[PDB]
Amino acid sequence: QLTEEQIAEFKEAFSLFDKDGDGTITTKELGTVMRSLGQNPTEAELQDMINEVDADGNGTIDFPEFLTMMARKMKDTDSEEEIREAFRVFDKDGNGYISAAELRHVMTNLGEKLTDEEVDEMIREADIDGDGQVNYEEFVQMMTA
């Protein structure tokens, strides 16, 4: 279902990691590219990211595993259910809504906190109506294209 040109685009990205050209992405190559962009992952974080797509078990990412990950993104059934389950943790009403103030409060105070500009771009992406509630159901349908 993927065009031959967007496969070549994903191949170009894969080759950026695969510096030695052996057809695999190690933690060495994944972390080197991340740290060239200013990111600083730990060694354990590199292993967790690779193990999410390593279907063989040798601790590397080959090109076919890279193609499926890039093609799927978040458009899978399991992602839509789990992101919806994440929003429900902050919905004590259970009606599928969360107030814009509480959502802003959660995003800027829990986990990898969003900056003020990040949460402002998120709230603008989700239309508020009436009291200030945002249908997070519509929000997960939007993120999962």
Binding site: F10, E52, V89
Partner: protein, 75 residues
Amino acid sequence: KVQEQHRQKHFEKRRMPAANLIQAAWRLYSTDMSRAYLTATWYKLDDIMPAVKTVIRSIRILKFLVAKRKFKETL
């Protein structure tokens, strides 16, 4: 009441991984629409080498997958 107080604490244990999942999903989604990439620098950068933004997206997908797993491990 103690049966009502310890299911809160375990439900609190999901608050952080749930937030991490929402944040990682939004940051992945914003890769293709954020004003952060709507600059003359990123347009030219995306023209001379579109592999850079694709690499950035590949990293965010990997981070979304880790966050989705850690949230499911609190069920």
